[PDB]
Amino acid sequence: NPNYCFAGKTSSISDLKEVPRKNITLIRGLGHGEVYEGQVPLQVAVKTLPEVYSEQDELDFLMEALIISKFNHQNIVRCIGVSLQSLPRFILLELMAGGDLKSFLRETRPRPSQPSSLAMLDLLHVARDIACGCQYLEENHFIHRDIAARNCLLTCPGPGRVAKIGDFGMARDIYRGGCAMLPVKWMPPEAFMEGIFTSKTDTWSFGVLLWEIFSLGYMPYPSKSNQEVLEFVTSGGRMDPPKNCPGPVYRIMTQCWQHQPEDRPNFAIILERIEYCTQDPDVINTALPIEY
Ligand SMILES: C[C@@H](Oc1cc(-c2cnn(C3CCNCC3)c2)cnc1N)c1c(Cl)ccc(F)c1Cl
């Protein structure tokens, strides 16, 4: 079985915690590979590998398990273990009842009925949570390559929610796809032009995630296609502030999108700037838009 290296240690599939299949019960689908709520009782999310998939898909599936299993940080989803000795293969993950961040933002947008569903501080806390996860990845020399709202999860819907990075499929592929599937709208110029990835790649992507968060779940670069975005960004074009976005928050975005990677902040600096935003009453007392 293939090996994987993280921090100072090397690992293989034999190192994955095998959970006996008989101890695992599926409860319900969680919007689908497919994903289920399961019990081991320990409440888990079950990621399945379709049996009709290929040997390569098999290897990618296991590699993702290895990757997540080796992280240890509060803002990265935990891997409970795996069930690889029976078909279909399972990966067992921390159950994140709040679901993915993009869906959460879109479904929890403040309304005339629920105008106080979300406030600016909630959004800043989500941003801080994911930045803390990104800082951990940066300091351990791991490049995610696809930081985006769709790949972040929430522990729960309500106020105590914690956001975590949940999906590592892109980093898995590169570790061992088509052009139209590349997340170009989250990528800096040196990434989509030269295939160069560094931690400053993730900084750029985080800026786009910030826009996703403060837009309350809009697709980046409204009305633009991938190729149009490629030309737009290469020429110096950047997104406008989301509706009602505080200047200090938009400033973090535009720093994340500096053309030269050396001019973009690392995640320690991003975290400091997010923290300052949470301290500023003029920022956190800003009302979010209410869609009618
Ligand atoms: C693989 C899958 O895992 C989970 C999905 C979910 C999930 C998705 N949707 N929901 C809904 C369940 C019903 N209540 C609203 C959320 C829960 C929770 N925890 C997980 N570990 C997943 C998905 Cl489906 C999407 C993005 C991710 F980053 C990840 Cl890691």
| Structural tokens at position 237 | 């074009």
Sign of the dihedral through C-alpha 139, 144, 146, 147: negative
Token pair 């999906």 is found at 167
Mutate to test the pocket of ligand 1, among 26, 27, 35 (most ligand atoms within 8 A of CB): 35
The approach used to solve this structure was: X-ray
CA-based diameter of the chain, in Å?
Answer: 57
* Ligand 1: centre distance to CA 121 (Å): 23
**Whether residue 88 has a cis bond before it, omega within 30° of 0:** yes
Ligand 1, atom 23, residue with closest C-alpha: 100
CATH 3.30.200.20 domain span(s) along the chain: 1-95
The stretches of 117-224 forming alpha helices (DSSP H) are: 120-139, 169-175, 189-194, 199-214
The answer to whether 4 and 21 are in contact (CB under 8 A) is no
Specified resolution (Å)? 1.7
CATH numeric code, 96-280: 1.10.510.10
Topology of domain 1-95, CATH: Phosphorylase Kinase; domain 1 (3.30.200)
* 208 neighbors 214 (Cβ within 8 angstroms): no
What 3-state class would DSSP assign to 100?
strand
**Distance from C-alpha of 168 to C-alpha of 145, rounded to nearest angstrom:** 9
List every span in the chain annotated with CATH 1.10.510.10: 96-280
Q: What are phi and psi of 110, to 5 degrees?
A: -60, 135
Contact 169, 150 (CB under 8 A): no
Looking at the DSSP assignment, which residues form a beta bridge with residue 280? none
DSSP strand pairing (35-39 vs 25-29):
antiparallel
Rounded to whole angstroms, the Cα distance separating 254 from 204 reads 9
Q: What is the DSSP string of 237-280?
A: --PPPPTT--HHHHHHHHHHT-SSGGGS--HHHHHHHHHHHHH-
Joined tokens for residue 56: 């390569």
